[PDB]
Amino acid sequence: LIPTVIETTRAYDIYSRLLKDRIIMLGSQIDDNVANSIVSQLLFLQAQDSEKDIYLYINSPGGSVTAGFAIYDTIQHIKPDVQTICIGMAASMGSFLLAAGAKGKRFALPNAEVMIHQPLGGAQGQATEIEIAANHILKTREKLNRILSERTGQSIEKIQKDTDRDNFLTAEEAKEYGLIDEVMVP
Amino acid sequence: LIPTVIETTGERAYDIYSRLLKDRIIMLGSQIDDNVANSIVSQLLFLQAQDSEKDIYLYINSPGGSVTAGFAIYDTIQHIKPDVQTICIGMAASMGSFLLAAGAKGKRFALPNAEVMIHQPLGGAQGQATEIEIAANHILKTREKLNRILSERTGQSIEKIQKDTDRDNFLTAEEAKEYGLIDEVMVPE
Amino acid sequence: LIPTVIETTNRGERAYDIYSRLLKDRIIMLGSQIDDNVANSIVSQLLFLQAQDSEKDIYLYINSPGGSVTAGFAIYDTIQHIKPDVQTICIGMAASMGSFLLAAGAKGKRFALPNAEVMIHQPLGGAQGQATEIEIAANHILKTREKLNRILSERTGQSIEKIQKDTDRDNFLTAEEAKEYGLIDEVMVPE
Amino acid sequence: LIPTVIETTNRGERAYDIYSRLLKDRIIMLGSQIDDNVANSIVSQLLFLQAQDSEKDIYLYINSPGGSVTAGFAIYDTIQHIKPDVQTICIGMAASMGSFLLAAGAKGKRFALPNAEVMIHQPLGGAQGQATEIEIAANHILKTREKLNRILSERTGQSIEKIQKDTDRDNFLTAEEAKEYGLIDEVMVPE
Amino acid sequence: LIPTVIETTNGERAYDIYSRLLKDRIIMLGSQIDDNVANSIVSQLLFLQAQDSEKDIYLYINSPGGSVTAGFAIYDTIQHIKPDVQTICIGMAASMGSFLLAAGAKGKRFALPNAEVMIHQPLGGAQGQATEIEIAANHILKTREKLNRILSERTGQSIEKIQKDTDRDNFLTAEEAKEYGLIDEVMVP
Amino acid sequence: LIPTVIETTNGERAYDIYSRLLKDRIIMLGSQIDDNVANSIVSQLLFLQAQDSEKDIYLYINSPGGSVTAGFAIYDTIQHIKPDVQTICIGMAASMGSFLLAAGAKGKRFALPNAEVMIHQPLGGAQGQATEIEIAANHILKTREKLNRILSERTGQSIEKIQKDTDRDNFLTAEEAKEYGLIDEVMVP
Amino acid sequence: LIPTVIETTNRGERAYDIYSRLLKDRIIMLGSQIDDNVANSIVSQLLFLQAQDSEKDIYLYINSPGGSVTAGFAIYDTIQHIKPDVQTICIGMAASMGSFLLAAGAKGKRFALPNAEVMIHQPLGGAQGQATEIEIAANHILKTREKLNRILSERTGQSIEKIQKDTDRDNFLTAEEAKEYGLIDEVMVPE
Amino acid sequence: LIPTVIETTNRGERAYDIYSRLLKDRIIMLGSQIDDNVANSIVSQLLFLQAQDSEKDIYLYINSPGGSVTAGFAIYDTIQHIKPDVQTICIGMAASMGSFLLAAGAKGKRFALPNAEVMIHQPLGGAQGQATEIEIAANHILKTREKLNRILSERTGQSIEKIQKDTDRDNFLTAEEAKEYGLIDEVMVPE
Ligand SMILES: CCCC/C=C/C(=O)N[C@@H](Cc1cc(F)cc(F)c1)C(=O)N[C@H]1COC(=O)[C@@H]2C[C@@H](C)CN2C(=O)[C@H](C)NC(=O)[C@@H]2CCCCN2C(=O)[C@@H]2CCCN2C1=O
Ligand SMILES: CCCC/C=C/C(=O)N[C@@H](Cc1cc(F)cc(F)c1)C(=O)N[C@H]1COC(=O)[C@@H]2C[C@@H](C)CN2C(=O)[C@H](C)NC(=O)[C@@H]2CCCCN2C(=O)[C@@H]2CCCN2C1=O
Ligand SMILES: CCCC/C=C/C(=O)N[C@@H](Cc1cc(F)cc(F)c1)C(=O)N[C@H]1COC(=O)[C@@H]2C[C@@H](C)CN2C(=O)[C@H](C)NC(=O)[C@@H]2CCCCN2C(=O)[C@@H]2CCCN2C1=O
Ligand SMILES: CCCC/C=C/C(=O)N[C@@H](Cc1cc(F)cc(F)c1)C(=O)N[C@H]1COC(=O)[C@@H]2C[C@@H](C)CN2C(=O)[C@H](C)NC(=O)[C@@H]2CCCCN2C(=O)[C@@H]2CCCN2C1=O
Ligand SMILES: CCCC/C=C/C(=O)N[C@@H](Cc1cc(F)cc(F)c1)C(=O)N[C@H]1COC(=O)[C@@H]2C[C@@H](C)CN2C(=O)[C@H](C)NC(=O)[C@@H]2CCCCN2C(=O)[C@@H]2CCCN2C1=O
Ligand SMILES: CCCC/C=C/C(=O)N[C@@H](Cc1cc(F)cc(F)c1)C(=O)N[C@H]1COC(=O)[C@@H]2C[C@@H](C)CN2C(=O)[C@H](C)NC(=O)[C@@H]2CCCCN2C(=O)[C@@H]2CCCN2C1=O
Ligand SMILES: CCCC/C=C/C(=O)N[C@@H](Cc1cc(F)cc(F)c1)C(=O)N[C@H]1COC(=O)[C@@H]2C[C@@H](C)CN2C(=O)[C@H](C)NC(=O)[C@@H]2CCCCN2C(=O)[C@@H]2CCCN2C1=O
Ligand SMILES: CCCC/C=C/C(=O)N[C@@H](Cc1cc(F)cc(F)c1)C(=O)N[C@H]1COC(=O)[C@@H]2C[C@@H](C)CN2C(=O)[C@H](C)NC(=O)[C@@H]2CCCCN2C(=O)[C@@H]2CCCN2C1=O
C-alpha cells in the first residue's frame, strides 16, 4: 500500500515524511475529511515555523466548495507563503486552490491539466425551496468569480463567460490566464 | 374489476365510465399525467361536437400530478362553449383542486366530506448554477401563473394565495366554499 | 379469473361476468382494498343504479380491509346523497374504512354473517421533514379522526369519547359484538 | 391457457371456457390459495346458483392449500346461509382452511378421492411492535383458533380437546383417515 | 403465439389449436404440473366423460412433472371416469409426468421412439424445529410409499426394486420404459 | 489518510494531526453530528477542563450538523465546564453546527471570511397511528421552541424573528452571521 | 477516529484513547444502542472498577437510545450487585432501556444536564407463526413489561398503574420533568 | 470498541483489553452467538487456564442466545474434561445452547443474576431435497435432541419426558424458575 521510509538522525509513511519538510499533499476529492486534515497541517506548520514557506501539491478533481473554502481561508490567514504546485490535474475547486497560492509561487508541471467550471448542485421539492437553493448557488458563484478575478487579474465578466462551460487548460494556458505564475521546467 | 352495464332503449353493453360519458359526465379519478390529460381533452372536445349548448360534468377524485397536463385540461374547459360543472368527491388536491375551481361560476360543488388541498408546485434541478437558475425561474413563473388564475377564480388576492399555498393546506367542503374554490356544498336531496 | 354466466329473457341470451350479473340485480361488490380506482367504480355503480330506479334498494356486500380514507368518503357521501336505501352486508371481514362503510348503510338494513369479523381503528399516516411540515400533517390526520369519530357516533349511537377510546388500538369484534355496538343492526340467520 | 369448449345447447351452439362450462352444471372450483378475490368469486357463484334454483344441489370441488381465514369464513357463511345442499369433493389436496371448507359440506355429501390429501393445522399470523399490540394480535388469533375448533367439533363429531391436540402441529391425513375423523363422509370409489 | 385453425360447417368455426384437439378428446399435458394445470386437466377429463362415457380419451404428455398432490388429482380423475385414458409421451415424461404416463389404460400407454422417460423419488423440504422436520419427513416418506405401491401395480416390478431404481434420477429410453412396465408400446410411424 | 507529526523532547514523540491539536486544547468538530461524534467531543471537553480549569478551549467547526440530542450533549458540556470555549467556523457550520457556533463564549465566536453559516428548523418524521404522529409532532415542535429560546439569548434576536428566519433554510455569509448575533468577529489574516 | 491523549503519570508518560483515559477515573461511557456487545463491555468495566476499589464511586454517563432489554438487565443487575455507588448522568438523550438504566443509579446521585432528553415507553417485540407461538411471545413480552414497571415503581416512587399509563405511548420528558417524576434526583447546574 | 486497562505488579505496567484482563483472573466471557470461532476461543481459553493451574476454579460468564449445537458441545466436553471446577453465571440472557452450557457448570456453582432470563428449546434445523435426504436430516436432529435431553436430565434432576415436553416450544424462565428447574443452583444476591 503506502510505503515506509527510514531516516537516520525513525520510520515514516511517505506522506508524513514530506510533511516534515513542509509539503502538504492535496491528492484526492475534496470533502470535509480532506479539508480538515489540510487545515490542521497548515496550522501545525505555521506553529512550527511562522516564516518558512509551505508547499501545497495538488492532484485533485475538486469536490465540495465549502470544504475548499476551509482550505482557502486557512492559506490566506497564516503568515507563511503557501506555494502551490499542480501535478497531473487540478480541476474545479482544486484549480481554485492552485490559484490561491502566494503570488509568484504558483506552479504547474508541463503536462499538467487545469480545469475551470461553474459550481455544481441540486434541489428537489417546492418552488420556494428550489428558489432558495438557486439563489444560494448563484451567490456562491459570484463569490468564486470575485476571488478568481483578484487572483488572476482577469475581469469578473470574462471569468463568468469562460467558466459557463467546462474549460480545460494546458499548463501554458493556465499561466496566460493568471491561474499560475510559472510552468516548472525539467 | 371494471363492471359492465346493459341499457334498454336494441340493447348495448357499456363499461361503467363509458356509460356515464353518454350522459356527458367525465371522470377525473386518478393522478394527472399526459395520458389522463389527453383522454379528458378528447372527451371534452367530443361532447362539444355532440352538443355545444348542453352542460358537461367533470367529477374529480384526484391527487393532482403534472402541472402542464393539468393546464391542458384547464385550457380545454375554458375554450369550449358548454359550461363545465365540477364536483369534488373524496379528494381534490394540487392540480385537482385547481381544476375544481376552474368549473363554470355558480356550478362548482363538493360533497360534505370531500377534502380540498391546495399547495405550491413541486420540482427538481440538477447540475450547473445557471441550469438551476433556469429551472428555478421556470417553476416560480409557473407558480405565478397558477396563483393569478386561482386569484381570479376565488376572489382572493395573489398574496393571500401565496401565503395559503406556501405549505400544504387542507380544507373542508365548507372551508373551500368560504374560500371561493367552490360555490356550493352538495347536500343530500 | 372471473367466471362467466349466461342469462335468458325477452331480449335473449346474454353473457356476463359474475360481478356484472350481480350488478343487474342492484348488488355492488366491495371486495378489495379501498383505493381511488375501487371508490370511483363504486361511486359510478351507485349513481347508475339510482338513474335506473330511484326507489328500489341497493345492496353493498363488504369484504374489505379498508385502505384510503378519502376514497372511502367518496363512497360514503354517494351512499348518503342518493335516494335509494343502501343495505350493507359484511361477509368475512370489514376492517377499518370497510367497517365505517358497513355502519354507513341505511338504518335497520345493516347486516353481518355469523362468523364475519369487524375491526375498528384510528386512521394511519406519515410525515417526514421539517417541524412545521410534521405539525400540519399531524393536525390533518387528527381532524380526519375527529370527522370519522363524529360520523361513527351518529351511525352507532355511541359517544365520540367511547369511540375515541375503543379505536385507540385495533379493536376486533364478532358479528354479535358489532350488533351490540351499533355498527350493524342484524346478524344474518342461515337457511 | 385454459381450454375453450364448444357445446350444442338449446338456445344454440356456444363457446365456453371450461370452468364457466362446469358452473352451468352447478359446479364451483376452489383450486387456488384462498384470498379475498377467490372468496368473493365463490360467494357470487353460490348466490347465483341459489337464484337459478333454490332446490338443486351445488358441488364444490376443492384443491386448495388454504390461505386467509376471514376469506375462508366468507365462503363458509355463504354455504350455510343458502338453501341448497353444498357437496364437497377433495381432489388432490385440501389443507388448512381448505380442509375446513371440505368439512363444511352438507352432511352425507363430503367426499375425498382415494389418493387425495387432507391437512389440518392451527391458524398462522404475526405481530411486530409494542407489547400492547402483540397482546391484541395474540388474543385475536387465539379467539380465531377457538372459533375454528368449536365449528370443527360440531362438524366432525370430535371434542374441542382432541382437535386442539391434533392441530397443534401440521397433521397429514389420508382420505380413509379423513373419513374416520369425520372431516369427510365417504371415500369416492371408482364408479 | 397460439395459432388459430378454421373448420367448415353446413359456415365456419375458429379454434385455438389446443381447443381443436380437445374436440377430438385429446388433452395436452405439456407443462410443469401445478394446481392450475391439474384443475384444468381434471375439468377436461370430466367434460369428455359427460360428452361420451364410451369413447376413449387421449392424454398427450410432455411434462417434467411438478406437484405430487396436483399429479394425484389427475391420477384419481383418470381412475374415476369410465372412458379409457390413453397416454402418449412426446419429448419427455419426468417425475409425476412419468407416473401419469404409467397410469394410462392397460395396453394403451405409448411413447414415441426418441421420447425420454424419467423416474425419481419425491422432492421436498422443511425448516424449523426438530418436531416440524420429523413430521415433514414422515409425510414425504409415506407419499413415496404411496407412489411406489401404485407404480408396482402398474409396472409389475416389486416395491423393493422401484425403491432402488428411483433412489437417484433414472433416465429411460422409450424401449427401456416399455420393458420396465411404464408403457406397453413404442409408437412407430 | 491521517498524517503523523513528530516533535522533539529533552527524545521524540509521534502524533496523528488531530491528537496533536488537542494537546494545545483544540477540538475538531469536522463531521456530521451523531452520538459517536458527540461522546468524543464531550470527553475531550471534560479532559481539557481536568488538565486546566483556567485556560481557554477552542472548538473548530466544519459540520453540517446532524442529531439535535447529540448536539445538546455538546452544548450542555460547553455550558457546564469552567473554561471559555471559543468557536471558529471554517468552511460551513450548518443546522446544529451553527447552533454550537453561536454557543461559544461571549466575544469569542469566530468565522473565516469565506466560511458559510446555515440556520434552519429541526427535521424529523413519524409513521403510524394518528396518536403516534401527534406525539412526534408535539415533541419536535417543543424541541424547536427550545432551540429558538437559546438562539434568542445568544443572538439578541427575538424568538419571533428566529422562527421566521429558520422556517426555510437561511444561508448567511460570515459578515451576515456576525451582524445576526451568531458570531462576534470575522477572523481576518 | 477517536483522539489519543498523552498524560504524564506516576509510572510514566502514557498514551491513551480518550475513553480508556476516562475509565482510569472510574467513568464508564454508555453512548450507543444497547446490544449484547455493549452490555458485556459495561459489565466487565463495572467489575474491573470494583476490583480496583470496592469503596469509591463509579460514574456512568448515558447518551443512549436503548436497545435490548436483556442486555439492559445485564447492566442493571451488575450495578445493583457491586458494592460501590453507581452515579448516572444523562447527557443528550436517555431513551427506553437508556432511561431505565438512568433511573437505576444510586439514590441521590442520578443527574440530567439542563437540555438532556429522557424518553419512557413500553417494550418492543415480534412474533410470526402459529397461534401457540404468538401466545408465548405475547406472554413473554407482557411479563417483561411487568418486570420493568415493578422495578421502575420502586425507583421512581410512582405506582405501577401510573407507569403503565405513562409508558403506553412514547413519553418525552425534559430534565426537570424527569426530576419531578423521580427518574433522576437532580438537574446538573452549570458549576 | 473495547476499552483498555493498565495493570501494575512486580513485572510493571501492562496494557490489557478488558476481556484479556478478566482472563488473567480465570474469567471467560461467553457473550455472543455460539459459532465455531467463539467455541474454539472458549475451548483454547479453558485449556490454557488448566495448564496455568489445574486446581483453581474457572468462571464462565454467559450472555448468549445460543447458536450452533456442535460448537456448544465442543465447549461442553472441554468443561467436563478439564480438572478445575467451571462455575457458570448467567447475566442478562442464557438462551438455547447458552442455557445448556449454564446447566453444564460444576454442581453447586451455577448462578444467575435476579433479573437474568433463561430460555430452553428444542434444536433447530432444515432439509431440502429428496425424501431419503430429508429422512437422514430428520433422524440426525432427532438423535441430537435425544442427546441434549439426556444430558439436561443429568444436570437438572428432571426426567427426559419432562424436558421433552417443556422444550417442545420456546420456554422462558426467570432466575428463580431456573433454580427450581435445576438449571442453576443459586440466584446471586446483590451487595
Ligand atoms: C500545534 C497546534 C497549532 C494550532 C494553531 C491554531 C491556529 O493557528 N489557529 C488560528 C485560527 C484558525 C483556525 C483555523 F482553523 C483556520 C484558520 F485559518 C485560523 C489562530 O487563532 N491562531 C492564533 C494563535 O493561537 C491562538 O491564539 C489560540 C491558541 C491556539 C492553540 C488556538 N488559538 C485559537 O484558536 C484562538 C481562536 N486564537 C486566538 O485566541 C488569538 C486571539 C484572538 C484572535 C485569534 N487569535 C489570533 O489570531 C492570535 C493572535 C494573532 C495571532 N494569533 C494566532 O496566530
Ligand atoms: C368529434 C371530434 C371533435 C374534435 C373537436 C376538436 C376541436 O373542437 N378543436 C378545437 C381546438 C382545440 C383543441 C384542443 F385540443 C383543445 C382546445 F381547447 C381546442 C377547434 O379548433 N375547434 C373548432 C372546430 O373544429 C375545427 O374547426 C377544425 C376541424 C375540427 C375537426 C378540427 N379543427 C381544428 O382543430 C382546427 C385547429 N380549428 C380550426 O380550423 C378552426 C379555424 C381556425 C381556428 C380554430 N378553428 C375554430 O376555432 C373553429 C372556428 C369555428 C369554431 N371552431 C371550432 O369550434
Ligand atoms: C346514467 C348516469 C347517471 C349519472 C347520475 C349522476 C348523479 O346523479 N349525480 C349527482 C351528483 C353526484 C355525483 C357523484 F359523484 C356523487 C354524488 F353523490 C352525487 C347529481 O348531481 N344528480 C342529479 C341529477 O343529475 C344531474 O342533474 C346532472 C346530469 C347528471 C347526468 C349529471 N348531473 C350533475 O352532475 C349535476 C351536478 N347535477 C345538477 O346539476 C343538479 C342541479 C344542481 C345540484 C345538483 N343537481 C341535482 O342534485 C339534480 C336535481 C336534484 C336531483 N339531481 C340529481 O339527482
Ligand atoms: C343472481 C343474483 C342473486 C343475488 C342473491 C343475493 C342473496 O341471495 N343474498 C343473500 C344474502 C347473502 C349475501 C352474501 F353474500 C352471503 C350470504 F350469505 C347471504 C340474501 O339476502 N338473499 C335474499 C334474497 O335477496 C334479497 O332479498 C335482496 C335482493 C337480492 C338481490 C339482494 N338482497 C339482499 O341482499 C337483501 C339484503 N336481502 C333481503 O333484503 C332480504 C330481507 C332482509 C333480510 C335478508 N333478506 C332475505 O334473507 C330474503 C328473505 C329471506 C330470503 N331472502 C333471500 O334469500
Ligand atoms: C360437463 C361437466 C361434467 C361434470 C362432471 C363431474 C363429475 O363427473 N364428477 C364426479 C366426481 C368427481 C369430481 C372430480 F373432480 C374428480 C373425480 F374424479 C370425480 C361425479 O361425482 N360424477 C357422477 C355424476 O355427477 C354427479 O352426480 C353430480 C352432478 C355432477 C354435475 C356433479 N356431481 C357430483 O359431483 C356428485 C358428487 N356426484 C354424485 O352425487 C353422485 C352420487 C354420490 C357419489 C358421487 N356420484 C356419482 O359417482 C354419481 C353416481 C355414480 C355416477 N356418478 C357420477 O358419474
Ligand atoms: C480526565 C477525565 C476528566 C473527567 C471529568 C468529568 C467531569 O467533569 N464530569 C462532570 C459531569 C459532567 C459529565 C458530562 F458528561 C457532561 C457534563 F457536562 C458534565 C462533573 O460532575 N464534574 C465534577 C468533578 O468530577 C466529579 O466530581 C466526579 C468524578 C469525576 C471523575 C466524575 N464525577 C462526576 O461525574 C460526578 C457526577 N460529579 C460529582 O459528584 C460532583 C458532585 C455532584 C454534582 C456533580 N459534581 C460536581 O459538579 C463536582 C462539584 C462541583 C464540581 N464538580 C465537578 O467539576
Ligand atoms: C478484575 C477482575 C475482577 C473480576 C470480578 C468478578 C466478580 O466480581 N464477579 C462477581 C459476580 C458477578 C459477575 C457478573 F458478571 C455480574 C455480577 F453482577 C456479578 C463475583 O462473584 N464476585 C466475588 C469475587 O470474585 C469471586 O469470588 C470469584 C473470582 C472472581 C475472579 C470471580 N469470582 C466469581 O465469579 C465467583 C462466582 N464468585 C465467588 O466464587 C464468590 C463465592 C460464590 C458466590 C459468588 N462469590 C462472591 O460473591 C464473592 C464473596 C462475596 C463477594 N464476592 C465477590 O465479590
Ligand atoms: C499451554 C497449552 C496447553 C494445552 C492443553 C491441551 C490439553 O490439555 N488437551 C487435552 C485434550 C483436549 C483438547 C481439547 F481440545 C479439549 C479437551 F477437552 C481436551 C489433553 O489431551 N490434555 C493432556 C495434556 O496434554 C497432552 O498430554 C498433550 C500435550 C498437550 C500440549 C497436548 N496434548 C494432547 O493433546 C494429547 C492428545 N494428550 C495426550 O497425549 C495425553 C495422553 C493421551 C490421552 C490424552 N492425554 C492426556 O489426557 C494427558 C495425560 C492425562 C492428562 N493429560 C492431559 O491433561
Author numbering:
A (entry chain C): 3 to 11, 16 to 192
B (entry chain G): 3 to 11, 14 to 193
C (entry chain F), D (entry chain E), G (entry chain E), H (entry chain F): 3 to 193
E (entry chain D), F (entry chain D): 3 to 12, 14 to 192
Give the published text.
Two rings of seven ClpP monomers stack and interact to form a secluded barrel‐shaped tetradecamer harbouring the 14 catalytic sites. Small entrance pores at the top and bottom of the barrel restrict access of proteins and allow isolated ClpP to degrade small peptides only. For protein degradation, Clp‐ATPases are required (in Firmicutes ClpX, ClpC, and ClpE) to unfold designated substrates and thread them through the entrance pores.
To increase our understanding of the interaction between ADEP and its target in S. aureus, we also determined the crystal structure of ADEP4, a particularly potent ADEP congener, bound to S. aureus ClpP. While typical features of ADEP‐bound ClpP structures from other organisms can also be found here, a specific feature of this SaClpP:ADEP4 structure are the well resolved N‐terminal β‐hairpin loops lining the axial pores. Here, in contrast, residues 4 to 10 and 16 to 20 are well defined in all seven subunits. This generated molecular switch ultimately leads to rearrangements of the unconstrained axial loop stabilising the open gate. When ADEP binds, it stabilises the upwards pointing β‐hairpin conformation. As all ClpP subunits within a ring adopt this up conformation, the pore lumen is no longer blocked.
